[PDB]
Write a protein that binds this ligand. Sequence first.
Ligand SMILES: N[C@@H](CCS)C(=O)O
Ligand SMILES: [Zn+2]
Length: 753
Amino acid sequence: MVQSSVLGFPRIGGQRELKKITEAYWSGKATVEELLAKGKELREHNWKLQQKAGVDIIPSNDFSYYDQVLDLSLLFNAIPERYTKFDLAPIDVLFAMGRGLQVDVTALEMVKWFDSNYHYVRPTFSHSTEFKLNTAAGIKPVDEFNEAKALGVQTRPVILGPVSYLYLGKADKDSLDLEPISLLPKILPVYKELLQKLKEAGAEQVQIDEPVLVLDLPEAVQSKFKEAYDALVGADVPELILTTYFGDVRPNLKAIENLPVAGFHFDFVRVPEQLDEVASILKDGQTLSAGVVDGRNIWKTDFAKASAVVQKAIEKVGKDKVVVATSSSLLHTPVDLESETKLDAVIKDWFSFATQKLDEVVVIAKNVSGEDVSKQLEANAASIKARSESSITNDPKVQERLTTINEALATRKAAFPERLTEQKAKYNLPLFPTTTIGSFPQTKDIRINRNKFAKGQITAEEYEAFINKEIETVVRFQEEIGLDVLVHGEPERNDMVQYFGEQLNGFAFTTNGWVQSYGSRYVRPPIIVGDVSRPKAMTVKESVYAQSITSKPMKGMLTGPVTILRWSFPRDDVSGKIQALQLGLALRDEVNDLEGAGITVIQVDEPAIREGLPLRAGKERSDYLNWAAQSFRVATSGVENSTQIHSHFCLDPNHIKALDADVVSIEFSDDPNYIQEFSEYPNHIGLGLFDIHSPRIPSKQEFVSRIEEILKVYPASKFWVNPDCGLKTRGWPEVKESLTNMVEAAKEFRAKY
Ligand SMILES: N[C@@H](CCS)C(=O)O
Ligand SMILES: [Zn+2]
């Protein structure tokens, strides 16, 4: 009998209960007691759900109030002194570290979890760090194991392992020379103790996550797995299942081929081809957990293909030593497809969310164990077959237009220096031209009118009028502040990816398909279901209106192809690359419509352009850098030489050059040397002058200072002046003075040239 296994379950709740209750606690509507009661109920609910599906190996310690890496830092005493000064309970210390503390500590750094859309809180270590088991609050992994046990649910605790925990961490402000991995000897006894306590509590297996194995690791780091796991493994601890996901462990195979652990987990959804070699290093007695149900996407699994993968593993190591698993934690997928009320049934039949993936690992497990599941297999085969044959997936026009992609389509009529000549003639911008990034802060009357417009209570014309008033206000604001290259404020836009996805063929949307991004901030990504195309103008009306009321140049504002791809659920039947190129072609028609309508300054926002960087150096990485840049160039390369193309980012120098934008903005407000990278590079650059997440106002002199610093490493002829990013999240008085000061700073320099 082949067991089924779930590496972690999303914890936000089927109706976002975690968000409401944690925000109610932070706001003061709810007590901490209510907070913990509600966590307990979610955990219990998710455990019963997995037991009822028939999952054998069910996780615990996967729950978190904020972030599981942060939970380990609390638990192991990786707590910087700055967070202890305020008579705080452990759970408020956790929230302090996680989200800062309004008396003003900054939150610890949030960092992207590999190439997932989740963010963790970076473990932060000092020379003074003293690792130990904080048993004050309770020991969360032991307490949550015992809870699940009292329900009659045996679970497998999940903890991030010592190597990855340290390696993914950073030396604190006060210890810039400390190498985190050098702490391995201090933290090992603390892991050992925790594992003893879990065994004592009744844990027979522990899932110990070592995802850094899918990265490029120094040889000196690779040797530490043998050191860590020789120390951890013994009779007085649970069996350890060393767990990896998101990538290829093969280059690091030497580091794990002689480890005393009870088994391994590998991701055969991202890297099925690694199976033969990883299977071959299993010792007699070791188990192989085969990750064949994707933890990061929303597509119904192909039961025949998944079973085949599992069957290849059984061949190599025997049926008794194989486990059917989710490829990673289901943290990265929405909770329940059954909550969806709007999707057409044909499309929904192609999806499985977290709750459904429980059923998938169970059926696949039954199948290779020899139980009769033909009805499920045939139902699955039909879903897969309907999807591959649907006209939605295969658009002939789009397929042909892909055949036109070549380097000529991704090259502008002339190089920057010629282009600059024609742009100077046409716009005659001053030195130190000033701009902003696009968004300005919205009114109450806006959201209310959107809602009314969605209900048909005001007409299309009435709503248009309200948007244009907002645009009018914003433009007049910018004029009077003396900005040089204006924006329309994006008041019509909810979201920089959904706004576009809704207007493209090939996308579907959910009502409830929420995934945690960080803390209590959740996203509901679009889904790319098929071939993408643009049926009509998406942004032209608003931009034409904005330009029609000022003589300043107005930026069109688009989100680039790679950002749209990376912030959506992608298709799994075609490559990232093909999806980006189709998006680039679709955006090229929009650029063409803008330019044709007189919007001849156009910004393409690519904040996530690097987020898909393949996790290892090699062919796949260099291909990615090439196609990401090509897909941007395909969108922007059909314009006239005098059309000024901008790009915004928030980051490899040379990748940025390969985009060949006339003008760049880059989140900044930080070593000077980085800027010296662009000195003999002709295109123009605006390095963000202020943090838009703060309400604080820099002085004129502040700005003058900041500019003069950059100016020592970068010529005045190329320098734009702008904020790090949009201003959608700020208040109007912060905005007014900050932009005033920014621009009068600029003019002071303008005058001395
Ligand atoms: N144009 C967008 C950029 C966000 S990355 C804005 O100003 O908000
Ligand atoms: Zn931005």
